Amino acid sequence: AAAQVLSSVESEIGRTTDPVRMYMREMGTVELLTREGEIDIAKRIEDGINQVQCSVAEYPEAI
Amino acid sequence: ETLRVDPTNDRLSALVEIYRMMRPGEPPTREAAESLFENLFFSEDRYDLS
Helix, strand or coil, X not given: CCHHHHHHHHHHCCXXXXXXXXXXXXXXXXXXXXXXXXXXXXXXXXXXXXXXXXXXXXXXXCC | CXXXXXXXXXXXXXXXXXXXXXXXXXXXXXXXXXHHHHHHCCCCCCCCCC
């Protein structure tokens, strides 16, 4: 339910210059992932941080 | 002639068109459009002349 919404909005906007509606359209495409999305995002962030730390440890000039 | 020009078929399409006319640039939803249509005219604290 992302392409149809954008198409309907672009076909309905009669040269409207309201930034609030544009922001609501830009933020309305992404849905919510409760109790399951934020945890995965945090896990991926921690994995990336650990990868950066390993890359730094393999680079002895920083130490 | 009005029915011939009007492309809407049921009450849902009518509410969608009204919601798109009132606030364009916003995706139309059934619940929000119904609430707006009930609060604009069918509200006692909002719509009452004298």
